[PDB]
Design a protein around this ligand. Sequence first.
Ligand SMILES: *[C@@H]1O[C@H](CO)[C@@H](O[C@@H]2O[C@H](CO)[C@@H](O)[C@H](O)[C@H]2NC(C)=O)[C@H](O)[C@H]1NC(C)=O
Ligand SMILES: *[C@@H]1O[C@H](CO)[C@@H](O[C@@H]2O[C@H](CO)[C@@H](O)[C@H](O)[C@H]2NC(C)=O)[C@H](O)[C@H]1NC(C)=O
Ligand SMILES: *[C@@H]1O[C@H](CO)[C@@H](O[C@@H]2O[C@H](CO)[C@@H](O)[C@H](O)[C@H]2NC(C)=O)[C@H](O)[C@H]1NC(C)=O
Ligand SMILES: *[C@@H]1O[C@H](CO)[C@@H](O)[C@H](O)[C@H]1NC(C)=O
Ligand SMILES: *[C@@H]1O[C@H](CO)[C@@H](O)[C@H](O)[C@H]1NC(C)=O
Ligand SMILES: *[C@@H]1O[C@H](CO)[C@@H](O)[C@H](O)[C@H]1NC(C)=O
Ligand SMILES: *[C@@H]1O[C@H](CO)[C@@H](O)[C@H](O)[C@H]1NC(C)=O
Ligand SMILES: *[C@@H]1O[C@H](CO)[C@@H](O)[C@H](O)[C@H]1NC(C)=O
Ligand SMILES: *[C@@H]1O[C@H](CO)[C@@H](O)[C@H](O)[C@H]1NC(C)=O
Ligand SMILES: *[C@@H]1O[C@H](CO)[C@@H](O)[C@H](O)[C@H]1NC(C)=O
Ligand SMILES: *[C@@H]1O[C@H](CO)[C@@H](O)[C@H](O)[C@H]1NC(C)=O
Lengths: 29, 49, 48, 48, 276, 382, 48
Amino acid sequence: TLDLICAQKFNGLTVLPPLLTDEMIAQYT
Amino acid sequence: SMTKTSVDCTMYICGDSTECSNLLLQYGSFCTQLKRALTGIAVEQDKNT
Amino acid sequence: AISSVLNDILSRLDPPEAEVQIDRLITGRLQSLQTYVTQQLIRAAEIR
Amino acid sequence: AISSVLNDILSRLDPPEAEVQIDRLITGRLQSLQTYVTQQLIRAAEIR
Amino acid sequence: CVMPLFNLITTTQSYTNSFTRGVYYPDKVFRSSVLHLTQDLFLPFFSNVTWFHAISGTNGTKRFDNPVLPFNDGVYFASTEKSNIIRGWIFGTTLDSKTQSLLIVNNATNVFIKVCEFQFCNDPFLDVYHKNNKSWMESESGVYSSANNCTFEYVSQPFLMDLEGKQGNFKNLREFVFKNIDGYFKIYSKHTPIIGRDFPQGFSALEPLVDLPIGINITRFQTLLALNRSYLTPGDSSSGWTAGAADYYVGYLQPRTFLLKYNENGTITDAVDCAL
Amino acid sequence: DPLSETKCTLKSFTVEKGIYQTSNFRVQPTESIVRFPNVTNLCPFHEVFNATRFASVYAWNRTRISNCVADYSVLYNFAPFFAFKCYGVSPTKLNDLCFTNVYADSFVIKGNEVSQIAPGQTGNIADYNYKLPDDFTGCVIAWNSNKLDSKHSGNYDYWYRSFRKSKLKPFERDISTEIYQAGNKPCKGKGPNCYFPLQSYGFRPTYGVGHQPYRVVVLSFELLHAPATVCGPKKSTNLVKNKCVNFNFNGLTGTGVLTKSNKKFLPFQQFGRDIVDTTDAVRDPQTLEILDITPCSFGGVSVITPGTNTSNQVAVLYQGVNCTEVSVAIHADQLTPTWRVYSTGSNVFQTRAGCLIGAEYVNNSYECDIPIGAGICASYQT
Amino acid sequence: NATRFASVYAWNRTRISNCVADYSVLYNFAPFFAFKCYGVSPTKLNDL
Ligand SMILES: *[C@@H]1O[C@H](CO)[C@@H](O[C@@H]2O[C@H](CO)[C@@H](O)[C@H](O)[C@H]2NC(C)=O)[C@H](O)[C@H]1NC(C)=O
Ligand SMILES: *[C@@H]1O[C@H](CO)[C@@H](O[C@@H]2O[C@H](CO)[C@@H](O)[C@H](O)[C@H]2NC(C)=O)[C@H](O)[C@H]1NC(C)=O
Ligand SMILES: *[C@@H]1O[C@H](CO)[C@@H](O[C@@H]2O[C@H](CO)[C@@H](O)[C@H](O)[C@H]2NC(C)=O)[C@H](O)[C@H]1NC(C)=O
Ligand SMILES: *[C@@H]1O[C@H](CO)[C@@H](O)[C@H](O)[C@H]1NC(C)=O
Ligand SMILES: *[C@@H]1O[C@H](CO)[C@@H](O)[C@H](O)[C@H]1NC(C)=O
Ligand SMILES: *[C@@H]1O[C@H](CO)[C@@H](O)[C@H](O)[C@H]1NC(C)=O
Ligand SMILES: *[C@@H]1O[C@H](CO)[C@@H](O)[C@H](O)[C@H]1NC(C)=O
Ligand SMILES: *[C@@H]1O[C@H](CO)[C@@H](O)[C@H](O)[C@H]1NC(C)=O
Ligand SMILES: *[C@@H]1O[C@H](CO)[C@@H](O)[C@H](O)[C@H]1NC(C)=O
Ligand SMILES: *[C@@H]1O[C@H](CO)[C@@H](O)[C@H](O)[C@H]1NC(C)=O
Ligand SMILES: *[C@@H]1O[C@H](CO)[C@@H](O)[C@H](O)[C@H]1NC(C)=O
């Protein structure tokens, strides 16, 4: 499994989603 | 792969402060370097996957 | 610096005296950012 | 700083005036430690 | 400053374990579900706290233990009593009129706090007695003879402390923490019911009670006990001053680093003494 | 416009096909609200500064000032202001801050001894009469008082400590009258190696300006945001909620939206912090209400272009933000980058990467051309 | 406590060596109008 996240996003630090979703990775597999 | 992170330098160092941003402008292109490095890391994560 | 809050330093000092504390905070936070980005680059190389 | 010895600075100055030299030494030695650890990380990646 | 002649017993200082008691709230900040590392003046886990008893014997000898004790960095006080024999404290360096001294007293209707150059007696105490056999009330005549050059006064906290009764054991586990930092006399307190008889094992954080900005120099402290003019023990015809049973423990605060656990409601539910 | 911002970011008039993290968007505050307590009684500065008699320097009078509004404009009325040295605070900003406690150390010294009343100073008064802490925050006001502290026959009521065994610690008052001893021989009275520590000032009007009596008051402050107490004369405004505003809660300055909170503060608690020491909640000084504080919406802004030679059309991705909030900020004109892209209704799409404006979402699937994220890609197509 | 002092343009440089420097004597015969110590703490003079 992957508030701290809110505070991290609260001062300039964002997290970018991966281009391929987990559904697409499962499709490739 | 790992988590792709983006950092806003002005928010992190001088959050919504104009005096601090004007002072930070004196340090050159350190923050453009940091942004470029993080962008390269994120693109590399996508390439890895 | 006297405080870690930028608003406090801006509210309690004139720009001449504020600039010293602002520069101290800028140096510290820039060092933190540089350290984070360097560790991220090394970890990204390992992940690659 | 005036000296590279911490005891000398502590013995020849009051804490207000000592703090400046102490901070200079702290910054220098922290930079040295950070440089050493970064080079160690890169060399450890190569050894890995 | 008149004291009836008593067969006073020399104070004997027992020793007991502090377990994990004595944890208070370091600041006014609210935290939820957080493990917080804080360096502050704490009572270390499993240290010795001194133990004293104040009682009136059945043979006429009464143990009236009010010895002068050092304050050091801070003091943790624990009290168990039924008739509120412990009524307050004194604080100061010379404990005379030469230097300003702090005095906290239960007025039985309010709480009195004074900072004055009090002319304390040899063994200051509060005189509780029965006027007209109708009104029980207290007097401060036995504490000090005169007060001059007062700088701080505070009559507040109209609380009778123990009011639920004596269900478990006096329901009066009174824990206090006294600190003197930056000219602030900080008093934290907690009123824990006793599951047992003396010093139950458990954890209870001390919510701050009052931060008096008296700004005076304090290095000594002493407990204040209430003496009642007879008519306390049924079946006793001995016309004389008697004091009820009371026990109090004293520990000394030292600079320790603690890891405190704030739950989802902001209450410190556990603590770890990093140097234990 | 976004294309020009991309051109400036790349420092080139030509832009290749791709997505460029160009700027950062921010929702701007719409109002400024300040919350200050009901306290209205002015602080007794006149009593401290216009006292009939001032204590001696070795017996400096520490007056306690708390639970009042500190209007410093009164100090400008009855003071020539020979010295107005504020250390750690700006004297012009005194009217906007909140001080936990005020200490007024009032005494009388000589004219030339004013410079000795400062942290890190050395001298007879600094070392044996009154010493300030190294980290002292507050102000020092010194003004001449020759017309009220001088006598024709000599004013001997003012005394200063000239000899002492050790230098005075900060905020330490010495009133001992023990005769100073030089050496190891005990002193039983005035004579060899015995001198009285206290010397009378003997102020006279005929003396020079440098020797004229000067009244010095040191205002020591405890600039903490938790206890508040004594603050300046600022008119508190109404409290707004669910709107991004600049809030001034009892001296605590910030920007964000204040919402109703389920957090249950204990009565002594005044504000709440987060695991990383970021302020999560505050208490209203008036209503005693627990308000969650959330910084106004912000994030990255990326520009998707097919290449400046293929087309000048671009799309904008506001990263990690709901399209509703972006549209609301555009309606109220709160977005920091003010080059708003024209919105049609089919031009606005919600990806897990954020709000995309200027690109039409089609139901066909193609090979990725410009990676937007979360399985979403953009392309310049008919 | 010299009877005569040299002129400022002809300042007298006295050499002090091979002795114990007890600075408590200086506090006896001096009103101490100025006691400015640069690079050293005047309170620490008795320990160095
Ligand atoms: C924190 O407070 C909440 C309420 O805000 C407490 O939840 C209550 O728990 C009691 C005891 O089990 C129940 O009777 C109530 O119905 C609960 N209330 C709600 C709204 O769920 C919670 O127990 C408190 N936390 C702790 C550790 O005591
Ligand atoms: C130090 O200054 C304080 C300022 O409050 C003086 O306090 C006086 O206290 C009395 C009550 O005891 C008040 O009624 C007066 O109003 C206060 N004085 C003034 C001038 O307002 C205190 O007396 C001063 N002490 C010395 C030694 O000067
Ligand atoms: C400068 O000061 C020195 C201090 O030593 C003077 O030296 C004198 O030297 C003679 C021998 O030539 C000694 O006997 C004396 O004791 C010294 N003088 C004193 C006052 O102790 C020197 O003369 C001084 N020069 C000037 C121009 O003043
Ligand atoms: C307290 O000291 C006594 C001395 O009699 C000793 O027996 C006891 O073990 C000590 N307690 C603690 C908790 O150290
Ligand atoms: C406080 O009083 C004690 C006892 O006289 C003394 O030793 C100590 O130095 C005093 N502290 C201060 C700060 O004056
Ligand atoms: C105690 O309280 C009474 C009222 O109940 C009040 O009049 C009195 O001043 C207080 N203090 C004493 C008796 O010292
Ligand atoms: C109170 O202050 C006065 C005036 O300075 C002084 O004479 C006296 O000794 C002090 N103490 C008492 C107990 O009156
Ligand atoms: C200073 O002025 C105040 C306000 O008018 C007055 O009450 C006080 O007596 C004055 N003090 C003097 C004249 O010493
Ligand atoms: C201020 O006044 C309001 C009513 O106007 C009251 O509810 C509130 O408790 C007061 N705040 C205080 C006393 O701090
Ligand atoms: C954001 O849009 C999502 C997806 O339609 C919706 O569920 C949610 O309510 C919106 N939230 C806000 C704060 O506008
Ligand atoms: C200074 O004092 C010394 C020691 O007593 C003495 O020898 C010397 O003559 C004095 N110098 C004068 C008075 O100029």
